[PDB]
mmCIF file of all heavy atoms in Angstrom:
data_model
loop_
_atom_site.group_PDB
_atom_site.id
_atom_site.type_symbol
_atom_site.label_atom_id
_atom_site.label_comp_id
_atom_site.label_asym_id
_atom_site.label_seq_id
_atom_site.Cartn_x
_atom_site.Cartn_y
_atom_site.Cartn_z
ATOM 1 N N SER A 38 0.857 -1.179 0.021
ATOM 2 C CA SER A 38 0.038 -0.088 -0.014
ATOM 3 C C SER A 38 0.920 1.246 -0.072
ATOM 4 O O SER A 38 0.243 2.371 0.220
ATOM 5 C CB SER A 38 -0.914 -0.046 1.143
ATOM 6 O OG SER A 38 -0.314 0.408 2.377
ATOM 7 N N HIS A 39 2.191 1.013 -0.169
ATOM 8 C CA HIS A 39 3.175 2.250 -0.162
ATOM 9 C C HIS A 39 3.452 2.667 -1.650
ATOM 10 O O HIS A 39 4.094 1.972 -2.290
ATOM 11 C CB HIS A 39 4.541 1.777 0.574
ATOM 12 C CG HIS A 39 4.366 1.554 1.943
ATOM 13 N ND1 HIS A 39 5.379 1.941 2.915
ATOM 14 C CD2 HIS A 39 3.317 1.134 2.802
ATOM 15 C CE1 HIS A 39 5.025 1.704 4.192
ATOM 16 N NE2 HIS A 39 3.837 1.177 4.078
ATOM 17 N N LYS A 40 2.813 3.846 -1.997
ATOM 18 C CA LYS A 40 2.840 4.410 -3.280
ATOM 19 C C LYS A 40 3.550 5.723 -3.351
ATOM 20 O O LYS A 40 3.951 6.117 -4.451
ATOM 21 C CB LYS A 40 1.372 4.481 -3.866
ATOM 22 C CG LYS A 40 0.562 3.169 -3.725
ATOM 23 C CD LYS A 40 1.196 1.912 -4.417
ATOM 24 C CE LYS A 40 0.135 0.880 -4.736
ATOM 25 N NZ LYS A 40 0.732 -0.445 -5.014
ATOM 26 N N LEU A 41 3.578 6.423 -2.275
ATOM 27 C CA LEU A 41 4.375 7.677 -2.245
ATOM 28 C C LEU A 41 5.872 7.437 -2.361
ATOM 29 O O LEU A 41 6.421 6.581 -1.559
ATOM 30 C CB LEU A 41 4.042 8.459 -0.979
ATOM 31 C CG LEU A 41 4.731 9.902 -0.869
ATOM 32 C CD1 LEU A 41 4.375 10.827 -2.030
ATOM 33 C CD2 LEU A 41 4.338 10.602 0.454
ATOM 34 N N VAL A 42 6.515 8.147 -3.213
ATOM 35 C CA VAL A 42 8.016 7.977 -3.585
ATOM 36 C C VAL A 42 8.491 9.491 -3.595
ATOM 37 O O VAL A 42 7.866 10.287 -4.209
ATOM 38 C CB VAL A 42 8.297 7.318 -4.881
ATOM 39 C CG1 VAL A 42 9.742 7.410 -5.308
ATOM 40 C CG2 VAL A 42 7.830 5.849 -4.959
ATOM 41 N N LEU A 43 9.675 9.769 -2.810
ATOM 42 C CA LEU A 43 10.221 11.055 -2.520
ATOM 43 C C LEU A 43 11.723 10.974 -3.127
ATOM 44 O O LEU A 43 12.400 10.134 -2.669
ATOM 45 C CB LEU A 43 10.274 11.489 -1.120
ATOM 46 C CG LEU A 43 8.937 11.180 -0.401
ATOM 47 C CD1 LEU A 43 9.084 11.672 1.041
ATOM 48 C CD2 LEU A 43 7.745 11.977 -1.004
ATOM 49 N N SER A 44 12.049 11.845 -4.159
ATOM 50 C CA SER A 44 13.413 12.168 -4.578
ATOM 51 C C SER A 44 13.829 13.562 -3.959
ATOM 52 O O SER A 44 13.516 13.650 -2.716
ATOM 53 C CB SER A 44 13.587 12.127 -6.055
ATOM 54 O OG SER A 44 13.210 13.346 -6.713
ATOM 55 N N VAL A 45 14.312 14.508 -4.761
ATOM 56 C CA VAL A 45 14.465 15.902 -4.304
ATOM 57 C C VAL A 45 13.014 16.525 -4.068
ATOM 58 O O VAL A 45 12.737 17.002 -2.999
ATOM 59 C CB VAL A 45 15.185 16.766 -5.266
ATOM 60 C CG1 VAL A 45 15.540 18.092 -4.676
ATOM 61 C CG2 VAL A 45 16.403 15.989 -5.855
ATOM 62 N N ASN A 46 12.112 16.280 -5.073
ATOM 63 C CA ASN A 46 10.764 16.762 -5.131
ATOM 64 C C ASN A 46 9.898 15.551 -4.979
ATOM 65 O O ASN A 46 10.247 14.506 -5.575
ATOM 66 C CB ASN A 46 10.442 17.565 -6.469
ATOM 67 C CG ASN A 46 11.464 17.322 -7.507
ATOM 68 O OD1 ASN A 46 11.745 16.227 -7.807
ATOM 69 N ND2 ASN A 46 12.050 18.414 -8.114
ATOM 70 N N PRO A 47 8.786 15.547 -4.376
ATOM 71 C CA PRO A 47 7.891 14.367 -4.216
ATOM 72 C C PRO A 47 7.347 14.004 -5.591
ATOM 73 O O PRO A 47 7.060 14.904 -6.508
ATOM 74 C CB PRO A 47 6.699 14.821 -3.185
ATOM 75 C CG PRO A 47 6.756 16.242 -3.309
ATOM 76 C CD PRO A 47 8.226 16.737 -3.610
ATOM 77 N N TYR A 48 7.191 12.616 -5.848
ATOM 78 C CA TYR A 48 6.491 12.187 -6.992
ATOM 79 C C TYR A 48 5.033 12.293 -6.849
ATOM 80 O O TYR A 48 4.345 11.345 -6.406
ATOM 81 C CB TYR A 48 6.992 10.733 -7.263
ATOM 82 C CG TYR A 48 8.415 10.643 -7.837
ATOM 83 C CD1 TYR A 48 9.188 11.858 -7.954
ATOM 84 C CD2 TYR A 48 8.862 9.470 -8.190
ATOM 85 C CE1 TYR A 48 10.468 11.801 -8.443
ATOM 86 C CE2 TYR A 48 10.224 9.343 -8.715
ATOM 87 C CZ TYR A 48 10.934 10.471 -8.786
ATOM 88 O OH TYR A 48 12.292 10.508 -9.376
ATOM 89 N N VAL A 49 4.475 13.540 -7.138
ATOM 90 C CA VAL A 49 3.052 13.931 -7.075
ATOM 91 C C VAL A 49 2.743 14.581 -8.430
ATOM 92 O O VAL A 49 3.643 15.241 -9.015
ATOM 93 C CB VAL A 49 2.865 14.805 -5.763
ATOM 94 C CG1 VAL A 49 3.668 16.083 -5.878
ATOM 95 C CG2 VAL A 49 1.383 15.082 -5.631
ATOM 96 N N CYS A 50 1.424 14.600 -8.780
ATOM 97 C CA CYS A 50 1.014 15.397 -10.011
ATOM 98 C C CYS A 50 1.101 16.916 -9.801
ATOM 99 O O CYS A 50 0.568 17.435 -8.794
ATOM 100 C CB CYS A 50 -0.533 14.982 -10.354
ATOM 101 S SG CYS A 50 -1.012 15.677 -11.978
ATOM 102 N N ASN A 51 1.861 17.604 -10.662
ATOM 103 C CA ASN A 51 2.163 18.949 -10.514
ATOM 104 C C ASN A 51 0.903 19.854 -11.024
ATOM 105 O O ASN A 51 0.914 21.028 -10.834
ATOM 106 C CB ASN A 51 3.499 19.358 -11.210
ATOM 107 C CG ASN A 51 4.685 19.230 -10.266
ATOM 108 O OD1 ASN A 51 5.218 20.239 -9.865
ATOM 109 N ND2 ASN A 51 5.062 18.012 -9.913
ATOM 110 N N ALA A 52 0.007 19.236 -11.738
ATOM 111 C CA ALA A 52 -1.280 19.867 -12.230
ATOM 112 C C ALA A 52 -1.973 20.482 -11.079
ATOM 113 O O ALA A 52 -2.251 19.848 -10.115
ATOM 114 C CB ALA A 52 -2.041 18.896 -13.063
ATOM 115 N N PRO A 53 -2.316 21.807 -11.094
ATOM 116 C CA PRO A 53 -2.998 22.444 -10.019
ATOM 117 C C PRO A 53 -4.255 21.831 -9.564
ATOM 118 O O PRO A 53 -5.020 21.294 -10.356
ATOM 119 C CB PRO A 53 -3.369 23.915 -10.601
ATOM 120 C CG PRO A 53 -2.414 24.052 -11.752
ATOM 121 C CD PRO A 53 -2.177 22.796 -12.355
ATOM 122 N N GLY A 54 -4.384 21.617 -8.193
ATOM 123 C CA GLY A 54 -5.577 21.039 -7.553
ATOM 124 C C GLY A 54 -5.683 19.512 -7.735
ATOM 125 O O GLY A 54 -6.707 19.010 -7.433
ATOM 126 N N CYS A 55 -4.707 18.870 -8.321
ATOM 127 C CA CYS A 55 -4.716 17.367 -8.548
ATOM 128 C C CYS A 55 -4.013 16.752 -7.441
ATOM 129 O O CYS A 55 -2.969 17.278 -6.831
ATOM 130 C CB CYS A 55 -4.009 17.050 -9.911
ATOM 131 S SG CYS A 55 -4.263 15.343 -10.280
ATOM 132 N N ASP A 56 -4.611 15.608 -6.837
ATOM 133 C CA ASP A 56 -4.198 14.884 -5.597
ATOM 134 C C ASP A 56 -3.765 13.516 -6.009
ATOM 135 O O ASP A 56 -3.793 12.594 -5.046
ATOM 136 C CB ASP A 56 -5.261 14.981 -4.562
ATOM 137 C CG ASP A 56 -6.552 14.274 -5.017
ATOM 138 O OD1 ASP A 56 -6.568 13.586 -6.009
ATOM 139 O OD2 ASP A 56 -7.545 14.290 -4.233
ATOM 140 N N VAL A 57 -3.248 13.191 -7.122
ATOM 141 C CA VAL A 57 -2.606 11.952 -7.542
ATOM 142 C C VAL A 57 -1.187 11.860 -7.043
ATOM 143 O O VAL A 57 -0.403 12.681 -7.576
ATOM 144 C CB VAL A 57 -2.623 11.591 -8.946
ATOM 145 C CG1 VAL A 57 -1.985 10.283 -9.353
ATOM 146 C CG2 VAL A 57 -4.022 11.596 -9.606
ATOM 147 N N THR A 58 -0.991 11.126 -5.917
ATOM 148 C CA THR A 58 0.298 10.991 -5.220
ATOM 149 C C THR A 58 0.915 9.529 -5.555
ATOM 150 O O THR A 58 2.089 9.347 -5.199
ATOM 151 C CB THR A 58 0.235 11.306 -3.704
ATOM 152 O OG1 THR A 58 -0.545 10.275 -3.203
ATOM 153 C CG2 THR A 58 -0.411 12.649 -3.405
ATOM 154 N N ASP A 59 0.185 8.652 -6.102
ATOM 155 C CA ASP A 59 0.522 7.241 -6.333
ATOM 156 C C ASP A 59 1.504 7.144 -7.567
ATOM 157 O O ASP A 59 0.959 7.359 -8.591
ATOM 158 C CB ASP A 59 -0.744 6.345 -6.440
ATOM 159 C CG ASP A 59 -0.465 4.899 -6.854
ATOM 160 O OD1 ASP A 59 0.652 4.655 -7.257
ATOM 161 O OD2 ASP A 59 -1.338 4.075 -6.884
ATOM 162 N N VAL A 60 2.714 6.732 -7.303
ATOM 163 C CA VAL A 60 3.835 6.641 -8.281
ATOM 164 C C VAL A 60 3.460 5.820 -9.499
ATOM 165 O O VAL A 60 3.944 5.936 -10.558
ATOM 166 C CB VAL A 60 5.159 6.184 -7.615
ATOM 167 C CG1 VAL A 60 5.081 4.778 -7.128
ATOM 168 C CG2 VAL A 60 6.345 6.469 -8.497
ATOM 169 N N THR A 61 2.533 4.771 -9.204
ATOM 170 C CA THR A 61 2.057 3.833 -10.266
ATOM 171 C C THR A 61 1.095 4.471 -11.220
ATOM 172 O O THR A 61 0.818 3.821 -12.280
ATOM 173 C CB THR A 61 1.447 2.598 -9.589
ATOM 174 O OG1 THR A 61 0.209 2.991 -8.830
ATOM 175 C CG2 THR A 61 2.392 1.975 -8.574
ATOM 176 N N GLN A 62 0.512 5.593 -10.828
ATOM 177 C CA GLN A 62 -0.479 6.422 -11.579
ATOM 178 C C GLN A 62 0.185 7.634 -12.186
ATOM 179 O O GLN A 62 -0.608 8.625 -12.545
ATOM 180 C CB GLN A 62 -1.643 6.761 -10.705
ATOM 181 C CG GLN A 62 -2.348 5.560 -10.081
ATOM 182 C CD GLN A 62 -2.902 4.521 -11.118
ATOM 183 O OE1 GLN A 62 -3.628 4.988 -11.934
ATOM 184 N NE2 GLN A 62 -2.412 3.326 -10.961
ATOM 185 N N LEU A 63 1.525 7.771 -12.162
ATOM 186 C CA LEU A 63 2.180 9.153 -12.486
ATOM 187 C C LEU A 63 3.253 8.888 -13.622
ATOM 188 O O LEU A 63 3.689 7.771 -13.765
ATOM 189 C CB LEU A 63 2.946 9.684 -11.151
ATOM 190 C CG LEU A 63 2.005 10.321 -10.134
ATOM 191 C CD1 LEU A 63 2.793 10.468 -8.836
ATOM 192 C CD2 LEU A 63 1.282 11.511 -10.656
ATOM 193 N N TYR A 64 3.668 10.068 -14.319
ATOM 194 C CA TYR A 64 4.501 10.048 -15.452
ATOM 195 C C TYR A 64 5.465 11.256 -15.396
ATOM 196 O O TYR A 64 5.172 12.235 -14.799
ATOM 197 C CB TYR A 64 3.637 10.138 -16.747
ATOM 198 C CG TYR A 64 2.589 9.098 -16.893
ATOM 199 C CD1 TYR A 64 1.376 9.164 -16.227
ATOM 200 C CD2 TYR A 64 2.844 8.055 -17.799
ATOM 201 C CE1 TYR A 64 0.442 8.235 -16.361
ATOM 202 C CE2 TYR A 64 1.848 7.147 -17.985
ATOM 203 C CZ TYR A 64 0.687 7.167 -17.233
ATOM 204 O OH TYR A 64 -0.303 6.222 -17.466
ATOM 205 N N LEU A 65 6.593 11.105 -15.921
ATOM 206 C CA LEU A 65 7.607 12.266 -16.169
ATOM 207 C C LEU A 65 7.143 12.953 -17.564
ATOM 208 O O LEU A 65 7.437 12.344 -18.538
ATOM 209 C CB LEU A 65 9.044 11.652 -16.351
ATOM 210 C CG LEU A 65 10.157 12.666 -16.702
ATOM 211 C CD1 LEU A 65 10.570 13.338 -15.456
ATOM 212 C CD2 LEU A 65 11.251 11.998 -17.369
ATOM 213 N N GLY A 66 6.630 14.083 -17.412
ATOM 214 C CA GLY A 66 6.207 15.009 -18.556
ATOM 215 C C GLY A 66 7.265 16.012 -18.725
ATOM 216 O O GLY A 66 7.151 17.090 -17.935
ATOM 217 N N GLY A 67 8.245 15.849 -19.537
ATOM 218 C CA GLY A 67 9.396 16.794 -19.663
ATOM 219 C C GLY A 67 10.171 16.711 -18.361
ATOM 220 O O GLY A 67 10.696 15.581 -18.031
ATOM 221 N N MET A 68 10.186 17.720 -17.658
ATOM 222 C CA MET A 68 11.130 17.958 -16.404
ATOM 223 C C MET A 68 10.217 17.805 -15.125
ATOM 224 O O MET A 68 10.727 17.975 -13.921
ATOM 225 C CB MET A 68 11.830 19.259 -16.319
ATOM 226 N N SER A 69 8.892 17.521 -15.223
ATOM 227 C CA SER A 69 7.879 17.442 -14.131
ATOM 228 C C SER A 69 7.068 16.202 -14.160
ATOM 229 O O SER A 69 7.318 15.229 -15.026
ATOM 230 C CB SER A 69 7.062 18.587 -14.140
ATOM 231 O OG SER A 69 6.281 18.671 -13.016
ATOM 232 N N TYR A 70 6.172 16.002 -13.163
ATOM 233 C CA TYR A 70 5.466 14.636 -13.032
ATOM 234 C C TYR A 70 3.992 14.980 -13.039
ATOM 235 O O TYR A 70 3.610 16.045 -12.487
ATOM 236 C CB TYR A 70 5.864 13.985 -11.640
ATOM 237 C CG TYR A 70 7.321 14.126 -11.388
ATOM 238 C CD1 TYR A 70 7.813 14.948 -10.381
ATOM 239 C CD2 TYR A 70 8.292 13.385 -12.108
ATOM 240 C CE1 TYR A 70 9.134 15.117 -10.035
ATOM 241 C CE2 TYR A 70 9.653 13.530 -11.786
ATOM 242 C CZ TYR A 70 10.113 14.369 -10.775
ATOM 243 O OH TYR A 70 11.417 14.577 -10.530
ATOM 244 N N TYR A 71 3.178 14.141 -13.708
ATOM 245 C CA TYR A 71 1.767 14.372 -14.006
ATOM 246 C C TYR A 71 1.053 12.963 -13.908
ATOM 247 O O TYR A 71 1.770 11.925 -14.153
ATOM 248 C CB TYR A 71 1.432 15.032 -15.281
ATOM 249 C CG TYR A 71 2.195 16.296 -15.435
ATOM 250 C CD1 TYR A 71 3.341 16.434 -16.018
ATOM 251 C CD2 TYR A 71 1.603 17.454 -14.854
ATOM 252 C CE1 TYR A 71 4.054 17.669 -16.199
ATOM 253 C CE2 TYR A 71 2.304 18.699 -14.912
ATOM 254 C CZ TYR A 71 3.521 18.854 -15.560
ATOM 255 O OH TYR A 71 4.172 20.046 -15.634
ATOM 256 N N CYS A 72 -0.273 12.967 -13.580
ATOM 257 C CA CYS A 72 -1.071 11.702 -13.658
ATOM 258 C C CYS A 72 -1.444 11.467 -15.129
ATOM 259 O O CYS A 72 -1.204 12.350 -16.070
ATOM 260 C CB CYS A 72 -2.264 11.876 -12.768
ATOM 261 S SG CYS A 72 -3.611 12.732 -13.491
ATOM 262 N N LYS A 73 -2.176 10.368 -15.386
ATOM 263 C CA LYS A 73 -2.773 9.986 -16.728
ATOM 264 C C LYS A 73 -3.629 11.068 -17.278
ATOM 265 O O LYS A 73 -3.653 11.338 -18.423
ATOM 266 C CB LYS A 73 -3.710 8.688 -16.655
ATOM 267 N N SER A 74 -4.446 11.790 -16.416
ATOM 268 C CA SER A 74 -5.298 12.940 -16.628
ATOM 269 C C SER A 74 -4.665 14.157 -17.058
ATOM 270 O O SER A 74 -5.397 15.104 -17.514
ATOM 271 C CB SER A 74 -6.308 13.121 -15.572
ATOM 272 O OG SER A 74 -7.297 12.038 -15.411
ATOM 273 N N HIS A 75 -3.355 14.426 -16.769
ATOM 274 C CA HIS A 75 -2.608 15.755 -16.855
ATOM 275 C C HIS A 75 -1.303 15.574 -17.691
ATOM 276 O O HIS A 75 -0.685 16.639 -17.960
ATOM 277 C CB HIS A 75 -2.372 16.227 -15.547
ATOM 278 C CG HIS A 75 -3.548 16.926 -14.835
ATOM 279 N ND1 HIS A 75 -4.041 16.467 -13.626
ATOM 280 C CD2 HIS A 75 -4.552 17.797 -15.230
ATOM 281 C CE1 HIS A 75 -5.155 17.213 -13.325
ATOM 282 N NE2 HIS A 75 -5.448 17.978 -14.308
ATOM 283 N N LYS A 76 -0.828 14.304 -18.020
ATOM 284 C CA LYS A 76 0.416 14.152 -18.605
ATOM 285 C C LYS A 76 0.401 14.691 -20.042
ATOM 286 O O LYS A 76 -0.596 14.562 -20.675
ATOM 287 C CB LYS A 76 0.903 12.676 -18.619
ATOM 288 C CG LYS A 76 -0.199 11.681 -19.095
ATOM 289 C CD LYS A 76 0.211 10.257 -19.442
ATOM 290 C CE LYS A 76 0.218 9.928 -20.936
ATOM 291 N NZ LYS A 76 1.216 8.889 -21.280
ATOM 292 N N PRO A 77 1.398 15.265 -20.583
ATOM 293 C CA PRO A 77 1.573 15.749 -21.932
ATOM 294 C C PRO A 77 1.749 14.566 -22.839
ATOM 295 O O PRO A 77 2.002 13.497 -22.407
ATOM 296 C CB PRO A 77 2.823 16.700 -21.904
ATOM 297 C CG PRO A 77 3.769 16.177 -20.820
ATOM 298 C CD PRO A 77 2.725 15.642 -19.732
ATOM 299 N N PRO A 78 1.688 14.743 -24.168
ATOM 300 C CA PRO A 78 1.773 13.565 -25.092
ATOM 301 C C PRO A 78 3.108 12.808 -24.844
ATOM 302 O O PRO A 78 3.105 11.596 -24.734
ATOM 303 C CB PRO A 78 1.683 14.152 -26.548
ATOM 304 C CG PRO A 78 1.971 15.703 -26.255
ATOM 305 C CD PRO A 78 1.339 16.006 -24.937
#
């Protein structure tokens, strides 16, 4: 049940007001991290 991962910056969706913190639901979009709903192409 351990899905939060911390480097320098936490692996959380950077999209405003988004609360996806689960690393299994997150992506590297350029130099930042986003969920499926906010990730760039």
